[PDB]
Structures are given as C-alpha cells and as structure tokens.
Design a protein around this nucleic acid. Structure first.
Ligand SMILES: [Cl-]
Ligand code: NA
Ligand code: NA
Lengths: 176, 175
DNA sequence: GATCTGAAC
DNA sequence: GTTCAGATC
C-alpha cells in the first residue's frame, strides 16, 4: 500500500493522509523543553470551509506576540514553529494554505502543506506555547520592547515616516 | 497601455522600464539617509535570470541585520529588511524566476522584484543601515544577533530536539 | 539551482 | 477570503 501515487517535486507536495502518518513522530511527553511550554489553544479542522478554527485556552495569552509553538496531534509532535504575531494571526496565515492559492502560487508552500495535512488528518490539534522575554532596544533615540527583530522594527519606523513625509510607499513595496 | 493582461494582484505587474519610476521619491529626499551608506550594487544578468552583486562597502558585506533601500537612477524603488547579510537577501530575490513563479515555490515579492529589475536593466544602488543589536537571554544563555527572540528560541529548541531525538518533526524542513 | 517559513491585508 | 515578505537548503 503506497503512501501516494504521484512523483512529488518537493516535500511540501506530499500532504499527510491520516494520523498513521505520525506514528514515528516524537511524543510531546518526551519533549525536553515541555516545562517551559504551556497549552495555549487548540486548532479545529473545518474541512467544508477549508480552514482551521481556534479554541482559545490560555485566554490571557491569546493576544500576546512573539512565541515558539508546538502542534501536537494525538500526543505526537507534528511541528515546532514561531511567530512574532499572536497565535491567531499565525493561524490566519496557515488558513492561506488553500488548494486554490497553492494553484495561484500565492500562499507559502509551508502553509499549504500544514493546512492540507491538518485538514486530511482531521484531528483537533493541541498548541503548546512559550513566550520568550523581549529585550529592550534603541532605534533613532527611541526605546522599544516587542517581538520584532531590530531590522524589521527599523524598516517599519522608516516606512511609516516615509509615508508621512511623501504620502506614498515606494513602488516596490506593498506591506508596511 | 502599460500591459495588456488583467492582473489578479499587484505582484503580477512587472515594471517595464526606468520610466515606471518617474513618480518615485528621490533618494536625496529620504529623511533617514544619514543613517544609510552605499553597501553594494546589483547588476542584472538577463541571460541567467539573476542579479549579480558588486561589493562596495566591503567591510559590511557579511554584516547581518539591515534595512536596505534599492535606488535606480536616484529614485527609491523599494525599502526592505533582512536578518541575513545582503548577499543572502539577494540570493532570495534570485528565487523570483519565471519557472519558480509557475511552480508556486517563490514568493510573489521575489518574482515581482527580480523580474522588474531584470526588465528595467539598470545597475541598482543598495544603501544599508545596520541597527545595533540588543543582548537577550534564553534558557540561561545570552545572545546578541539579528534574530527575533522567538526565531532564535525556535532555532535553539529545534537543534536540541534534533540532538535528543536525532530527527526533526515531520512538519518541519528548515532549521 | 530551487525550496521553505511566516507576515500582512 | 487572499496576497505580500523574506529565510533557507
Ligand atoms: Cl523619508
Ligand atoms: Na519556523
Ligand atoms: Na519588508
């Protein structure tokens, strides 16, 4: 019994088909950093709508920015990732992994592989999180403490200032 | 007509010449310019569908964590950032090939920028600012680098996961 | 050469 | 519901 029949051009082409695909994964109970992580939320597959819904658990941290997360499915570690945004925005991003957008080439291959795999496995996903302490830093004589890299914050400050000065962004930019 | 197809998104519309920059802002009018220094130049290589680099500020070519400004004939084409050196960010722009856009495996940004710069076919001045990097602590170890704390935390956890378990999670490919 | 990861709207 | 940005192999 073959896992799939097509000849993948890359790993992200191969969508996981069931929980059986996780059988050689590492149990979350054997995760070495587990004492630093706390259950944050669950992701609920909604196949009809081709998206993941969120069951908020650690309510006080749902709007917290800058985390490492672990997706666990029936006790198995499916992935470890990070976000400078809250979990909700990162899940929003995973929800870009739709078949249509993959065909358009407008979603990341990661978001496609993860959303489609989670929808197909069709189990609720536990999300454990760790929120690192954020350093204070200085840019142009002002102090910041946030989830951003200093280069990203600097770019943001500069672009928002650029827009106020010239009432436009450069032609090569769309995001701020 | 600038082009003839109905684009579905901005990134679909590739700039055709330096004339497309006529309404852009001059680099001389950039308020943060005293913080920036000419780092390098990008040289379009249409035959190989890529950008080459001429290093200018040689001492800074391996510096990580920068804001950059791409300037063509005195006009600001874009402002961006990278936690890597400029060389790796350009490598990433060089992923913007037509084939990979068809594959859906490059970013739309890299496609738009590579294709537009190849078509404009001018040398691009790259101005750079390297912010100071804060020191931060994770799991009793201190770091001073260009990474966000969450990205550094992920990298440390992932490498130590691989040490302990001799594998990465099935859902991971990058470290 | 080519892909992977996450941010923004 | 859909595209935008950049890190990595
Ligand atoms: Cl400005
Ligand atoms: Na990651
Ligand atoms: Na940017």
């Amino acid at each position: 019994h073959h896992h799939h029949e097509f000849m993948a051009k890359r790993k992200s082409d191969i969508i996981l088909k069931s929980v059986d695909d996780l059988k050689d994964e590492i149990d979350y109970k054997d995760f070495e950093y587990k004492e630093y992580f706390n259950l944050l939320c669950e992701l609920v597959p909604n196949n009809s709508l081709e998206k993941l819904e969120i069951n908020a658990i650690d309510e006080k941290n749902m709007k917290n920015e800058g985390l490492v997360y672990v997706f666990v499915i029936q006790g198995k570690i499916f992935k470890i990732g990070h976000s400078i945004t809250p979990i909700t925005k990162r899940v929003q991003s995973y929800n870009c992994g739709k078949v249509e957008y993959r065909k358009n080439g407008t979603c990341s291959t990661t978001n496609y592989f993860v959303l489609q795999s989670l929808l197909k496995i069709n189990k609720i996903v536990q999300v454990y999180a760790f929120f690192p302490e954020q350093p204070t830093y200085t840019l142009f004589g002002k102090t910041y403490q946030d989830s951003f890299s200093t280069s990203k914050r600097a770019e943001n400050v500069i672009l928002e200032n650029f827009i106020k000065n010239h009432n436009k962004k450069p032609i090569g930019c769309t995001q701020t």
